[PDB]
Amino acid sequence: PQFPGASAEFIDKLEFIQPNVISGIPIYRVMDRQGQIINPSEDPHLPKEKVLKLYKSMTLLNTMDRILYESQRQGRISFYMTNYGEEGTHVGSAAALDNTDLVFGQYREAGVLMYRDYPLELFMAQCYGNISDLGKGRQMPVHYGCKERHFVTISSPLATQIPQAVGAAYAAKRANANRVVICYFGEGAASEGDAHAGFNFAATLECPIIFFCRNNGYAISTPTSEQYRGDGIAARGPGYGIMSIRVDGNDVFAVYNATKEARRRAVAENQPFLIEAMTYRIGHHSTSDDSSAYRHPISRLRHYLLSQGWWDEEQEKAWRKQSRRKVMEAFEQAERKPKPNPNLLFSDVYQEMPAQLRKQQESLARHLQTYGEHYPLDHFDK
Amino acid sequence: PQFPGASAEFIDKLEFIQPNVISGIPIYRVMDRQGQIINPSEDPHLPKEKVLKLYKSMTLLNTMDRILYESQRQGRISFYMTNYGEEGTHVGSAAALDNTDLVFGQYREAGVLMYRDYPLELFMAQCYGNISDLGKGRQMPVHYGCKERHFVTISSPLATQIPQAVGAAYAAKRANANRVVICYFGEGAASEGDAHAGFNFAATLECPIIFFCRNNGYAISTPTSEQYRGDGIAARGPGYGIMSIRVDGNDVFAVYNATKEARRRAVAENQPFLIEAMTYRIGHHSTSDDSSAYRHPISRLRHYLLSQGWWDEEQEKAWRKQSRRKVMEAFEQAERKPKPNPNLLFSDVYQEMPAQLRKQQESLARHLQTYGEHYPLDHFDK
Amino acid sequence: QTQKMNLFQSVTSALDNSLAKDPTAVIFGEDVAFGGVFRCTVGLRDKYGKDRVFNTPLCEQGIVGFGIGIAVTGATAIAEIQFADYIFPAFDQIVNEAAKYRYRSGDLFNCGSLTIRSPWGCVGHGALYHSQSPEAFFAHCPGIKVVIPRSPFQAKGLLLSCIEDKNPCIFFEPKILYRAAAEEVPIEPYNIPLSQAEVIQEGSDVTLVAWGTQVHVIREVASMAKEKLGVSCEVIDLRTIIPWDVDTICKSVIKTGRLLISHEAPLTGGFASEISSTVQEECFLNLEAPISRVCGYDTPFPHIFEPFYIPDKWKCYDALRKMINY
Amino acid sequence: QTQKMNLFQSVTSALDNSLAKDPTAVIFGEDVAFGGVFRCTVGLRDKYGKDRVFNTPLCEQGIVGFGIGIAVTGATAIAEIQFADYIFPAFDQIVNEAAKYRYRSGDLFNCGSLTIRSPWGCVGHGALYHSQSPEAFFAHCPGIKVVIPRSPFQAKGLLLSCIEDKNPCIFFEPKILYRAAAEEVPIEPYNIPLSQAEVIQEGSDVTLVAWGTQVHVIREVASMAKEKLGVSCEVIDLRTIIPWDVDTICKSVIKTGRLLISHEAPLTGGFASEISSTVQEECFLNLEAPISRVCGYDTPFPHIFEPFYIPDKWKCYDALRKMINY
């Protein structure tokens, strides 16, 4: 052969390669729909404590999702997106992570934060845009971020974080950080040009990164049958030279195992890893979407909790109450706080405020001195 | 399973899929480095006439490439890009095409036009930016185009034509045109976000399109080892659900066969096809590049021409002379023509000239009336 | 024959008239098949077919390249970008390709039958990525036309004009007006000249220029102005951004002697700049007061600070006061 | 200690000083490893390593997203876009991400240690895609800084300032000056304030503003001006486009009373608009003549018509004549 671009024997025969889409890449699963471990050789370590944290946070997220969605249906908050049916996805992966590892997301992985013990107060603060929000109420709800729990602030433009994450991973590599980077995205976002960029760069520059795709069958109204025709996302990884795997997104153990392995090898070989978690978006794409116009994780892990005598109905009954009380307690507290001081819309554009930008600042000031009665000054801070 | 995004049995075992890059996709070849047909069952129809056209145009292009490159090294033309080593690539595919089929290219497939009998006069006219150039000397040399030979005008931004081509193919499908569309691009361009877009859309919308990739081992200074880590481009096609094949780019028959088959099935099934032609960029990336700072088709088909007694040294000797004379004859003619009238830089921005745009037109007029002595008015038309 | 319509309904109307008249016309984008996120293409896929109204993958750069591809064929391509904030992934395809298709081919090929629609301007709380006004970015680009409507009637006429214009056109639809006040809109096709500003209220003391939702705002600032300072304002709707009605403007200003332009988009680099600098050159003698620009702040679009960000009627009015009090 | 340098050499210099000082600094882009297409990163990969200077795949949107990724880490990312004409595939990454990184995170994360270099302006015959001046496009975008140098000395100071500024900066390098006249340039690091215009020749009759290669042109139009019409022109180099030195300008104009701005970039939407409209508002009383704009035509950049396209010294001069003859 000798051709610089690829290595392969010749072939006397003209044969086009056909996509194997019928029996595509197998979906990896550890426990069945009844919390039963299929193949013991796959049962993870996982002490009762850790397994209960996975449960309590999937359910704490679910309890929170309800209170916030309703909150939206009452004009209390302007927007909201649920995680229904994708809780295993967040908690499994997160648990397989080292707390110092960097996370880059889309907007449907609030569970990652719940697991990393993000304060209910702050979850509510961001959605309300009140003073406690470190974001200073500048973005829409659900666009969380925490420099402390290493969760890169989420942005709306889909797939943009992918290439960014890879860059971040490269930086890591150079520092010999023993740290890996995880980048979440939906199957829809994978169609974006940045995904192509992200995967190639990651492989070409040899970066310690895990690509976590949430193939939940939908992208708002668009069915996967319209986003691609190959064997989903898992089947693209290899084309880029990326070790790839598919997992049962409703199996927290299968997600955990895959993630744990991907992290080990990624940080060890400085080799990109792709995990496609098959799942289903149970709730509406967002508060602004009536999913009925176009078209379980917790249950399973619960059984596994019974089969081991690690949980009972009384214990469960109490958890509903506590989590409820706790969520609702952060809820009220976030509700009655005033939004930041209006001067904050001009800061942080740059590190230092440009003189001209400051002139616009002072301008709003003079302006409010005269017409402030027509503004909601009472709702904001100062 | 039941997951909406993919169909596949589950799996008790945790196994990451590893890219098969060692024995990647086989490179299809019909004749050896000595014009000998390996597997007779692959020998194409191809009458002496057609096979000689393939030869004369690969060589006519080669003869032209030399005269223009030298022409650049003399300041006669501002820029130039050769095709050395990729002539089989242009002629094979083109011959397998129906003349009415639409072509979208990068800039290194002048052979496609040579085969479609594009006038030497016009090749020279564009590079010189003289009056006969239908482009009106608006783009750099080598950016050819012909609405008559159905060759979409080439543009510099890499990979942009890919998605455009697919759109064009969709239009076709709707018209029941029995027409297919071919879109050429280098292995480097395939890294562009638009490539990802182009391939997915093509499959997702079921379009009659052939993606022809010229994997020539380089992208200026960048070696393929830095553009990707998968099994080249051929291995990405399947991930998108695209029938894929790899071919010996220096084998005109292997290119012809692959192309002919891709066209049949593409127009028949409205199914995208990808052909990666392995080859090697013999010349510098462009006139502006000293390839020695970082790093055959004709020969082969010649032998095949001897082994069949279809060509001899006397006949060859004469062809060198004729083609030489003919090329050089178009050359001189293009040289002594004046460039278009300066008023042409304002036209065609829109279909109709905007009034304000016309005011700028008249402005240059008043301006030249007064300072035209400082301009090359004598070199331009009118 | 005429029916009362919502901005979003007049759009479906214009889009219906188009597929109905042009056998070639095709509508595509993200989530357009089932009617769209704002209900602009509702029913259309059923009335015309799966190959005339359909979903594309989630990739804006492909969406536009794809549209340019069809257009080159001579076929009408009506691409949709769900949010104007998400048109940047396709910026290269628009500026380097589309705006330069005809020119670079010496009129051998073009994508003049290409039209891109996209929800524009702010809404309740779009924050940073559902509120932008990209208009100015495309203004520095020869080859494309940029149109922004101010009501259901203007929408259908302008859109249809865009769809049939022989030049790539970007049609920005103020999403805040999609369900605002309705109005009688002709059931059948009809056009409104592109590149023609519309004076909807002549005045004699000041010329007010805006577009999109802002028009309704400068319209209010007018009511206030005279009623609170006895000043007759001439309200003008620019409509077309790139090939802009320079004349209608300069004429008005010549009669007025004062100019105040406003737009949600940020001040710096915003389109009001090109207008000011131009009118300054043209009506240099007629200008009695420095040209005024009431635009959004030089910052990204705030979620909770929107009320304080926008050039509301009060910001304009006060700006008008100081100008006049010149 | 100082050595005479080419624009491209001063760039290697600044880039060398940076990798030398900052253990974190990294340079990447298309064909940057072997020295670059214009020789700007020559030798650097050998002197510092394969993981500090390297080639990326051919994808500009990835190049910038990648750069933003490193920057977020606090590490210095110096991305290269071979041609300014090819920065649009990354426009979304620059406007929606980078320019909005700090702001949207309430200062929790930023890509302030990100710098993008890119060959700018025209050359012999770049035609449409090796000649563009994208500057104005990015000007309508809060969050990024845009710097353009006029000589080897200015290049190294400004670049180094950009590389160390705590805000994403786009550094446009006039490729036509890469091998032009040399000049003594300090061997070691040194900075030049960003957002500071430089008056390189005071005058009293007219203020001339330009940047990049144009500066040398308005500089010539000066020589001519006085020598042929007895008019003292104050030549100003803007240097920084987005956060622009509004004051240095308005001051000069106040002393002068007349303003002429010029730039290769197209007239419509070009940056001269923001300057004119601003100075008009500020120095409204001092203005004796309408502000003048000598820019490229509202068309794509021609291959063979370049000589007739550009705002050469003669176009400026004549423009100056009419202004003064006011």
Ligand SMILES: Cc1ncc(C[n+]2csc(CCOP(=O)(O)OP(=O)(O)O)c2C)c(N)n1
């Ligand atoms: C660049 C860009 N284009 C369009 C949108 C609008 N949009 C928001 S969410 C969405 C689809 C969701 O897709 P998927 O990746 O499947 O994620 P999910 O919400 O289903 O988990 C779209 C098209 C966007 N945010 N960014």
Ligand SMILES: Cc1ncc(C[n+]2csc(CCOP(=O)(O)OP(=O)(O)O)c2C)c(N)n1
């Ligand atoms: C969008 C864009 N970025 C950068 C360039 C500059 N550029 C021109 S040719 C080239 C590499 C050539 O790549 P390949 O696809 O392998 O084609 P070849 O010339 O080797 O056949 C690059 C990076 C460009 N034309 N367009």
Ligand SMILES: [K+]
């Ligand atoms: K994002």
Ligand SMILES: [K+]
């Ligand atoms: K192209």
Ligand SMILES: [K+]
């Ligand atoms: K059109």
Ligand SMILES: [K+]
């Ligand atoms: K910086």
Ligand SMILES: [Mg+2]
């Ligand atoms: Mg999804």
Ligand SMILES: [Mg+2]
């Ligand atoms: Mg190549």
